[PDB]
Design a protein around this ligand. Structure first.
Ligand SMILES: CC(=C/C=C/C(C)=C/C(=O)O)/C=C1\CCCc2cc(C)ccc21
Ligand SMILES: CC(=C/C=C/C(C)=C/C(=O)O)/C=C1\CCCc2cc(C)ccc21
Lengths: 214, 11, 214, 11
């Protein structure tokens, strides 16, 4: 109850109008600041205790940013568009040693989004579901987070079937990209910890903080 | 901990 | 089209009526044989080319077995029931160094299944969706696999809403456990590769083959 | 490759 897709869409429209790895890390750090503002625009999020707000963002920031640049890259030929306005071509990513993860983003996320023409409302809702992850460890009231999530996909399904009546399986199709997002999110984090370990690849303060423990 | 994140959320 | 939940349920009913790690590995090897038979009972699966059948099972066996023993453990206090008829108590898993992964299985999977009273038909369908993973690399016809998956969750949603009319968000709730299954599946595989690397912990032939490359 | 799996699927 009280989870209008209009507010979710607004949050998306409000936050967004040579080693490629380094460029990706700078873009991620950059978007981390924008991510917090996006979250504050998601209904009832800011109403949760500060401690749980931190846990939720800590637990889903990687998937949240990935979903975002992936959808942004729908208009891209063979690459990804970073928030900084730079483009990472497949060859560039390949030549940097990150071709494997790059190919997964394109095939499992970008390509699928483009083919089904995922819109900004749907993207917003999927990220809202990810943000409200009831499995996040440390939550003082997991039931409360579970409630918000249920309200999001409840509004999302309503959005679909209504906008896209001719596609009864659209709602499920949207939800079925979450497993790929989870796996891809995990691999990207592994690469980030390796970059931090090796020493090379400058990592900014906010991104570094997210890599911090726990 | 989580210096940056807390400050941003509070603002 | 042509994906009756009745057949899916039948497939589930047909395949199922001291270091805990070693017991878990023996149970997994054991279930790998049963898994192939379960797959053959899933409509249209055996109709796919041998090469794609292999890719699908290779790509989802870990998640398929995890979903299964997790649902089987619903009647368990604080532990998991293995197919071999042995029970792995939380303390036992903890004392073996696998308490973390063990806690995730219980909290993210077992507990959630029990609370919503996930039935055998629903479990069967969720596994069928996992089996028909269109993102599996190597597929000669990914579109064909995507088609079967869509037909499964199409029948699953029909099953729900009809059996559980009073729970409109049940279908989505079921699908929303797939992300946890994916993450948990990945961590368990990591533990398995470490067990194989260390040398200790006997690993049988079928399980070993699944650890093999690619 | 995938000795075991192939044999089982064929049967
Ligand atoms: C964790 C992460 C965050 C991305 C933030 C960005 C780039 C946001 C944006 O530009 O909108 C992604 C990584 C993290 C580092 C590895 C990596 C490699 C490829 C090919 C693609 C993505 C990634
Ligand atoms: C990959 C895997 C397969 C399990 C198969 C079983 C045990 C099937 C069954 O008994 O029905 C699970 C593992 C693999 C090894 C690590 C592990 C640890 C815990 C606490 C639980 C599960 C696992």
């Amino acid at each position: 109850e009280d989870m209008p897709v209009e507010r979710i869409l607004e949050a998306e429209l409000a936050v967004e109008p040579n080693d490629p790895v380094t460029n990706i890390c700078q873009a991620a750090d950059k978007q981390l600041f924008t991510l917090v503002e996006w979250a504050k625009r998601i209904p009832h999020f800011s109403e949760l205790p500060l401690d749980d707000q931190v846990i939720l963002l800590r637990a889903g920031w990687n998937e949240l940013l990935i979903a975002s640049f992936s959808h942004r890259s729908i208009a891209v030929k063979d690459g990804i568009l970073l928030a900084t306005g730079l483009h990472v071509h497949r060859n560039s990513a390949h030549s940097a040693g990150v071709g494997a993860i790059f190919d997964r983003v394109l095939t499992e996320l970008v390509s699928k989004m483009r083919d089904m023409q995922m819109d900004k409302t749907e993207l917003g809702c999927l990220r809202a579901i990810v943000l409200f992850n009831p499995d996040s460890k440390g939550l003082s009231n997991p039931a409360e987070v579970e409630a918000l999530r249920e309200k999001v996909y409840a509004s999302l399904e309503a959005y679909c079937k209504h906008k896209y009546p001719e596609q009864p399986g659209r709602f499920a199709k949207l939800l079925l990209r979450l497993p790929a997002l989870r796996s891809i999110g995990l691999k990207c984090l592994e690469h980030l910890f390796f970059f931090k370990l090796i020493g090379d690849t400058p990592i900014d303060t906010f991104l570094m903080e997210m890599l911090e423990a726990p | 901990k989580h210096k940056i994140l807390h400050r941003l959320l509070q603002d």
